[PDB]
Symmetry: C3
């Protein structure tokens, strides 16, 4: 099913009936509207104007389209901000932000909680029972523009409440944070302030708790809306649109309150911002890195407990990256089929028609400002026609699981210890290694059962709780733990047993020292797997175990005991691929050495091949395979689907 | 005529008579004084001390020198700032600036408007009728140190007044800005705030109007002083000293209130700050890039409706750039003759003697702190001697016009869409291309008649108003429009007809998509003109016209219909030169392939050749030409003048 | 003697007796404690809890260990900061800092002066007479985290008092600063504000006086504590722990109030932050640059009038640099012996045991968090065993003196004039040149007698006072003055005679112009010494003297008259080495061309050779020399000591 993000409030009413008709003719089934309409619904305080929205919904419904209503809390009206200045957030520099863009609100503001409650309840009671409305999207991209973390007075007071609920007594907090250090000791929760503008660095336990708190406030703000929708819009789904490479908000946790997860994919924008090698930045400028959308489809399929949508799909050039190229011919179709291959229930394009005014006037849509269909329209229509004849098999469990953790992202953000240490970079490195072997991946959270997986990869899990340890113990296949795993306690302290902490119940080894190294300083770690120059991060392991890979000084780089492996250094792409390939072979899994721009994803017994270019490549299909779409020779920016 | 910037208030009175005598002996005719003397004229509130200034003026006049008085508003006294804290400006970060340097005032402050009125009226009534006074310079470099744009309370309230005057009703503003977007809708002008510290980016229409407003406030502040000088100093000229590569202030607009334009040239400082290729940065470190002063002489000759002065000319190393080399031997003389060749009525050196104290103690003068003549003195004296025997022919209209627009600079500053898009960079690229062909250039504003020009180049003109379109329609020669021309309406919206908007009445083509590309991503555009690898910016053109240059995907890069051409991509220096050369040939204009460091400028039937080094070159003079200065063999940092 | 920094307040009391025993067994003699214990000594306002500290001291004393007590003013308790918000400092951006880290106090706060007085007096009266207490360390690293300079209201008012004391009258200040410039004239000291947030740059005289003031406030704050310790802890030494590459605080001046100087050495951290060439950054990542610790030992031996301690010595990886490698095997021992060779009376390791909580949990100690001895422990124990059998000869005067000045650092910080001009960089360049010649160095302040030195090097001394000139006149050997020496008067003005100002009484030459050049712009200066491509900084010298080195344009780069030499350009390492070698030969001093990683330091008739690696090298020992430690073949990260 395909959909689109539409803004009836940006166009003359006379255009609505035409737009709705064309959406149906294009083969679309869902249309999202309303997330930025508060100022149009309540232009004057207390005076609601539902007329135009009632009409827009009716117009779309008349064409048989299903409506997805976004609650309008991402952009409060100026009259509301003027009435309650406390709604405006404060940045890390201590400056109050201003109206003019979007997301200008604090998640801790009690006033905004009530205003959100009011408008969402009104929206839910009015449209919650309409057959035309399929569900809702709460707010819009919580946290975008660095808005999860606010440092205003409301947040400072709420943080104290959060801390008291978490620790019970200030004594427990002092012990947890180790406040004897630098005389940080607090006499009460009232003495604790937000961790910013400190002289020297803030306490890591202090900063991590603040990040946990900030994420929790977003979840609380969201929960309020979910409860309203459950009570006044029974039977209608509730989702939220998450972002690419964004970790300030714990999506796994927030999604527990949603029916499914949704996310917004803009491959070209993410890619331009990625620190790719010189050659790749040019090669993938108009296609996106081969794993950028896929990683997130897998992540969000996991965040949604198996169910997810791509609420926003890039259909042409965007406006927000340093460089905004046009997707190459066929890439919109490719990204769409890729989303579907990874399990997306719906792929919705942002947006129907390019706006000729305001901030995003340079953001392309399926149609140009003059309403003429743009390149993305034809590609989307083609997919609609192809999908109509290609009902898809169900998504099966992947052979490999990758354990992702938002808390881990926070810990490494707080304590990198090495300037080049990157949590997302480490996760992506392992992900790409698996993808280049032609393996499908399921991204799961700590504690999720690993039953059924050939093997699992844990890029890094600093805090290992009982639930996670339990899942690892019950794993039927090997589990590879990346560097710094089990290196921190729940309170951001070094475990008494030293890293890898709880994991020592599985692996008899201890990390007695760690090193972060300047770029360029490499040392070969060698063994049966091969020779690998490694750098960036290195750990000294004390263990009776014979390392599988050894550095030139005799120190081990990789260890294994039973089904558990531990990597004591930052992996190179080469090491990641060879190690993962060896684990695959051991597990009886077949692998393929896919060329740089080719990627595969299965759906039942079907296999999808996506070629990110720039030249044609052959799909590694079995002999006699039956092609459902495309051919064995896959042209650039094209794809093939076959019965394997 | 040569002049100098002098500060009698920095030296013992006993030195004044000597300085005046030496200025006359050097061959100088004009002396500028007083722009930073408020604290010396009014050391105590309400207590004026004209004594020393009366004497300084009398001393200079006794030597037959003409005095140019600068109004002292660039640097208000500390007692005044202490009395009225509102005078101090507020930066984009929301911080109030402080006294200690210069230009610490807000252009919107009603209090400062009155204080400026008071001191300027006093100055005008006292010296406005003196024969020794030739004219005035208002303030000093409006906008320097990022002072055009202030974000204080006074500016926020004045902006609202400006908006109401511009739009009439808030309804008109909401439509112009497209405030339905992100619920930005305003109920009144009172709800509109300045466009800074917003979450996400501010509305482009909002930011552009703020930039227009800021520039307008400077013009208003200046107009007040001009009116005072017209009323109390009748017959005395009024000018202002503009800066290099500065666009925050619309000089074309402000100069409408001046008798002529003046500007301050510091080639080495501008050059060190320019992103020149590795080789050029070293080659021109002590000479300045060959086109840096020339571009501004042409620009300001246009800003001044044909009349301009170089109020400040670099005579040695300066203090403000990251690197401050000494001008190579002969460069002060070269820059001076170049200014004169481009039409400068007067070239005034900053400054007479290097100050031994304060912020600019490392800024050289014609004399060292110990009063001994410095290298610049001898070079200036030589020019005085040479000019005395070389009365100059009148400046003639150039063969090529380059249309420059300050509003365009603001639009691209607001919406670059590509990190490397640079308005000044694009303008300079075209300018240098013309200069390397040996062609003289007239820089003109939109709407200025193009009658008489062989052809015209419009680097980029986003908003094309009726007056500009009229001028293009009446052009007698071809007009080349650069990328993004006609891409915006007066309210910063995409034209209904799409870019190039109004220009579609001249060229039957539409820009349906634009791309900004990462550095290094190049694609060849080829045709009769040649093969050109292009990047940075690319536009997709929909048109029945056969492109003159085509990319590898078949998309056109250059189009033409009648006398109008449209470039749909960022030009390379190579493309700019070949295209401009072809236009010159078509127009019957002779061109020359000048070597890297040689430049030409005509004055009547005379031709000036300037060699920026590092080695000697031959002047492309006709056979039998009569040399007025120098010889056919032009040494580095030297020049030649001949009757062509 | 070896010591350690210990934090009994971070560990269970049951561990104290064990720690003390192990410190004795390791061979340690001194233990520093208490500098961050205020919150533990006074958890509740007015309620002191000395119990635990009394016990910790008694426990250490029982093992025969000497205690060094740090006054606890570096980290005031939260209840105190809450009571007096004025204690918190304000940054250059005008923002009030917050509690959470350390050093969150203003040196001008009258309230904090009294609170410091109170707690230090209590500490001194209670422990000042104990036999177990050897001395005190005042506060902890004054200025760390950019805390010397504060811009709060208290500092603005104190600065005015400082100015009135310095100038007497505002008239004198106006003349000294040259306030006629840009109308900066002040009517009274009350009109003077701090030099920050100005529009354009602040007056250099103004900024320099502020920096002098800031340093003076630290000295005043410290003096208060010294007086208390002299009165209540008679016979106990008082020192302070200075930092590497830190110049905001004039250590020479502050140390006048101390019994000896101490400093904190972290070679790997300093080195990672240094702009070393690509190759060296990798080669010395785990060793530190060969001259980084040595330069500071020599500097602080001078700051301490011949006496100094290394209060904190890196024993493993740290937590605060972008990259934190582990010291290579043997480097802790090497750094320790190097400190001793340079005269350190005591080398104290930071810290005894790695903390498992808070900000520095990744900072290694002699023991891991689980109390197991770490690599540094064994290396420290080895040195203790070796030193026990190697009583050291006395430190003798070095053959070469290097004149260092904190005021010079401030002047160049205020007025770099060239982006690459670096005072510490220039000093280090000369230092390394001397070190690579195998010469020992004494770092002395301006005014210190140069009697006995073969020759002296003055990297740069902008202000040359009578005392300094006197010392130069009485020098028995040549004195080399670096560029910009004598270029400023005490009030930051250009001398009437022009640079080198007072030095013209020694050298008949004048600097008539200076140039700062872009990186890469080089020009050869040649003569008998050789050919040297030079850049960065170049001065034009007017003199009757024949230069020893001449540039391609005939301008001199190096001059000499009698025993005084003047370098008119930024030196290359090659020039520094050849010039210094020539001076050594002339003085009858033998030199050696030491390979990159080898360094020598004498102690009496003994010579120490330190090999920073990565490969073995031979110690340049005389034939038949008797080795006290090691052998002629010095392995990497190892050393040798012999009777030369
Ligand atoms: Cl739309
Ligand atoms: Cl002057
Ligand atoms: Cl400890
Ligand atoms: Zn908040
Ligand atoms: Zn203002
Ligand atoms: Zn302060």
């Amino acid at each position: 099913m395909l959909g689109v993000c539409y803004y009836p409030e940006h166009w003359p009413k006379e255009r609505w009936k035409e737009d709705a008709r064309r959406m149906r003719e294009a083969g679309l089934s869902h249309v999202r509207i309303g997330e930025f309409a508060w100022a149009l619904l309540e232009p004057e305080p207390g005076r609601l104007e539902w007329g135009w929205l009632d009409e827009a919904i009716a117009t779309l419904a008349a064409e048989g389209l299903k409506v997805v209503l976004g609650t309008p809390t991402a952009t409060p009206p100026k009259w509301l901000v003027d009435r309650y200045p406390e709604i405006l957030p404060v940045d890390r520099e201590g400056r109050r932000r201003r109206f003019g863009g979007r997301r200008h609100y604090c998640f801790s503001s009690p006033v905004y909680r009530e205003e959100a409650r009011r408008i969402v309840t009104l929206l839910a009671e009015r449209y919650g029972g309409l057959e035309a409305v399929a569900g809702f999207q709460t707010d819009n991209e919580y946290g975008c523009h660095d808005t999860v973390r606010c440092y205003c007075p409301r947040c400072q007071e709420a943080f104290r409440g959060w801390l008291e609920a978490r620790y019970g007594t200030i004594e427990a907090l002092n012990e947890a944070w180790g406040t004897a250090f630098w005389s940080q000791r607090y006499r009460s929760f009232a003495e604790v302030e937000l961790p910013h503008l400190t002289v020297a660095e803030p306490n890591p336990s202090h900063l991590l708790d603040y990040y946990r708190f900030a994420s929790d406030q977003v979840r609380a703000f969201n929960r309020l809306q979910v409860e309203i929708l459950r009570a006044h819009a029974p039977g209608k789904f509730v989702t939220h649109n998450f972002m690419g490479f964004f970790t300030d908000l714990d999506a796994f946790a927030l999604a527990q309150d949603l029916d499914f997860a949704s996310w917004d994919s803009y491959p070209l924008g993410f890619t331009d911002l990625m620190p790719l090698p010189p050659e790749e930045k040019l090669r993938y400028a108009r296609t996106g890195h081969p794993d950028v959308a896929a990683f997130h489809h897998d992540l969000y399929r996991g965040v949604g407990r198996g169910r997810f949508w791509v609420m926003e799909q890039q259909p042409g050039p965007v406006n927000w990256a340093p460089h905004n190229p046009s997707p190459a011919p066929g890439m919109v179709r490719l990204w769409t089929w890729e989303a579907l291959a990874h399990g997306a229930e719906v792929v919705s394009y942002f947006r129907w028609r390019q706006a000729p005014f305001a901030q995003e006037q340079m953001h392309a849509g399926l149609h140009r400002p003059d309403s003429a269909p743009d390149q993305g329209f034809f590609e989307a229509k083609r997919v609609a026609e192809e999908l109509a004849a290609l009902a898809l098999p169900p998504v099966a469990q992947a052979p490999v699981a990758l354990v992702f953790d938002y808390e881990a992202a926070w810990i490494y953000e707080v304590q990198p210890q090495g300037a080049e240490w990157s949590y997302l970079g480490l996760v992506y490195l392992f992900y790409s290694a698996l993808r280049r072997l032609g393996l499908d991946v399921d991204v799961v959270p700590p504690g999720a059962s690993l039953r059924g997986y050939a093997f699992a990869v844990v890029p890094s899990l600093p805090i290992v709780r009982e639930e996670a340890l339990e899942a690892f113990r019950e794993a039927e296949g090997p589990v590879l733990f990346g560097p710094r795993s089990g290196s921190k306690t729940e309170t951001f302290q070094i475990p008494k047993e030293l890293p890898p902490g709880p994991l020592q119940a599985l692996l008899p080894l201890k990390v007695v020292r760690v090193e972060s190294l300047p770029p360029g300083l490499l040392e070969v770690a060698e063994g049966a797997l091969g020779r690998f120059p490694l750098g960036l991060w290195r750990e000294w392991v004390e263990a009776p175990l014979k390392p599988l890979l050894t550095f030139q000084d005799g120190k081990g780089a990789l260890y294994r005991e039973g089904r558990y492996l531990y990597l004591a250094a930052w992996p190179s792409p080469e090491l990641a691929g060879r190690l993962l390939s060896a684990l695959a072979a051991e597990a009886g899994l077949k692998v393929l050495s896919l060329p740089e721009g080719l990627r595969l994803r299965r759906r039942g017994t079907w296999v999808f091949a996506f070629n990110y270019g720039p030249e044609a490549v052959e799909a590694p299909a079995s002999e006699g395979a039956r092609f459902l779409l495309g051919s064995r020779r896959v042209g650039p920016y094209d794809l093939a689907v076959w019965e394997e």
